[PDB]
From Swiss-Prot, chain A:
Residues the record marks as carrying a glycan: F195
Modified residues (N-acetylthreonine): T2
Protein family membership: Belongs to the glycosyltransferase 8 family. Glycogenin subfamily.
Subcellular location(s) of the protein: Cytoplasm; Nucleus
GO biological process: glycogen biosynthetic process
Quaternary structure note: Part of the GYS1-GYG1 complex, a heterooctamer composed of a tetramer of GYS1 and 2 dimers of GYG1, where each GYS1 protomer binds to one GYG1 subunit (via GYG1 C-terminus); the GYS1 tetramer may dissociate from GYG1 dimers to continue glycogen polymerization on its own. May also form a heterooctamer complex with GYS2 (via GYG1 C-terminus).
Modified residues (Phosphoserine): S44
Pathway(s) of this molecule: Glycan biosynthesis; glycogen biosynthesis
Name under which the protein is recorded: Glycogenin-1
Organism, scientific name: Homo sapiens
Function: Glycogenin participates in the glycogen biosynthetic process along with glycogen synthase and glycogen branching enzyme. It catalyzes the formation of a short alpha (1,4)-glucosyl chain covalently attached via a glucose 1-O-tyrosyl linkage to internal tyrosine residues and these chains act as primers for the elongation reaction catalyzed by glycogen synthase.
Known regulation of activity: Inhibited by palladium ions.
Site (Important for catalytic activity) location in chain: K86
Reactions catalysed, as given in the entry: L-tyrosyl-[glycogenin] + UDP-alpha-D-glucose = alpha-D-glucosyl-L-tyrosyl-[glycogenin] + UDP + H(+); [1,4-alpha-D-glucosyl](n)-L-tyrosyl-[glycogenin] + UDP-alpha-D-glucose = [1,4-alpha-D-glucosyl](n+1)-L-tyrosyl-[glycogenin] + UDP + H(+)
């Protein structure tokens, strides 16, 4: 494919490890779409060279630069450095449809059927299920929509510096219109690091297509032992082991 | 015609049913208030329940004449669940909104009776399943015997009732978005209905949502 792509984001070498694992798992399950990562100059030169081997396009985004299209918005909203960088995913008009994926996500099965949905399709947030989690969503790249989100980010800002409030406000019809824009939760399982005794966790892998390590603790923060294959994730350790198995096999030798 | 149906199996949850009954009446509900009671609640508590509610309907799954007693022998962990499922047997009403006894109504929710079966709010943690604390349903003996056979053939996760209802109404997450109640109708974590999920219930105490419960309790319930 050339008009559709998976888009991820990393602003440093830490989240770059998650993007490399996410990109690797997308290649493991054989996606016909392209793999794009939005990187910033804070990513080291050697880490960027590793991203070029796993991803088809490494697109540099520096909102701190005066010439960047979101810099004027950043001067008025300095707390949105990462958020405004992510919003650049709507400016990739060389694709007609994209799925954004957080760098702390992991693909367990082919999800190319996500391109059957329309903008904007996303999974419910596990805490407040009336809102959608912005870690995985189907969108349509548009210069116009990009400018409206920059405008909405200026007036609204963000309590935690994230983009969940801005996207939910702009796409305010998600909660009550078209059930087809409700992605199944298995396309964005963001409860693996929050809850331990969820009923769906009685199944190995929880029948998930995509798992999302939402929270303040990320997989690259754990200490791994490849000899034993071990490290609320203590009760369902398959997702931590899967992340580290792919990292040590696919990503670590490239470092 | 239409009624709000709650459930209590002991004198503890009846205190929450009385608080739920006051909140519905305080916010001017034009419907009947029904409560499913078991022989395990004291006669003093049933008499108090008979003043607040318009119908106190007795359910006893230990009675052999009850249709769910045989299923209880196979699944002794579904005592409360099988009693809760008796809400579908109240065929005298055409449409009912079942509410947990640990819920509290902060605004009129009579517009809930605009939905069909089965309409519920998504469940925190796993939002592709609905929370079984608040849901609109149509009473029917056909659906009752259907849920009875499903509970007998499968059971439920940790003896709850959400697993059975989500397995039966398996098309809730992907079919009709009008059957997805807004999360404010079952906030279990402004709001219209708050739900005190967890092991510790409001009556187990001695932040603003809990102070509203104890205000409604000591004012409209405790003098009885
Ligand atoms: O310092 C940061 C924080 C976030 N991100 C990117 O923005 C996303 C924000 O999601 P995160 O997992 O950090 O937040 P959570 O999902 O826990 O809310 C990450 O996945 C990355 O793609 C980044 O590159 N650098
Ligand atoms: O010992 C019990 C347990 C439950 N219930 C009823 O069954 C519902 C089950 O919900 P509960 O709040 O007990 O559990 P949770 O909703 O916290 O999962 C309660 O609201 C009551 O109406 C009851 O009467 N007695
Ligand atoms: Mn994330
Ligand atoms: Mn409850």
């Amino acid at each position: 494919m050339t008009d559709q792509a998976f888009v991820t984001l990393t602003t440093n070498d830490a989240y770059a490890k998650g993007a490399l694992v996410l990109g690797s798992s997308l290649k493991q399950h054989r996606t016909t779409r392209r793999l794009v990562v939005l990187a910033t100059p804070q990513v080291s030169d050697s880490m960027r060279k590793v991203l070029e081997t796993v991803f088809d396009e490494v697109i540099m985004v520096d909102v701190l630069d005066s010439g960047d299209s979101a810099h004027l918005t950043l001067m008025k909203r300095p707390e949105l450095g990462v958020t405004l960088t992510k919003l650049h995913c709507w400016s990739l008009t060389q694709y007609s449809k994209c799925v954004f994926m957080d760098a702390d996500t992991l693909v367990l099965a082919n999800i190319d059927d996500l391109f059957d949905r329309e903008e904007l399709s996303a999974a419910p947030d596990p805490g407040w299920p009336d809102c959608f989690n912005s870690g995985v969503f189907v969108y349509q790249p548009s210069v116009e929509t990009y400018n409206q989100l920059l405008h909405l980010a200026s007036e609204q800002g963000s309590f935690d510096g994230g983009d969940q409030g801005i996207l939910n406000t702009f796409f305010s019809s998600w909660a009550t219109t078209d059930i087809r824009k409700h992605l199944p939760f298995i396309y964005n399982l963001s409860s693996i690091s929050i809850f331990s005794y969820l009923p769906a966790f009685k199944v190995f892998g929880a029948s998930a297509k995509v798992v999302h390590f939402l929270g303040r603790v990320k997989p690259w923060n754990y200490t791994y032992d490849p000899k034993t294959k071990s490290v609320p994730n203590m009760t369902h350790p398959e997702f931590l082991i899967l992340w580290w198995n792919i990292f040590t096999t696919n990503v670590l030798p490239l470092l």
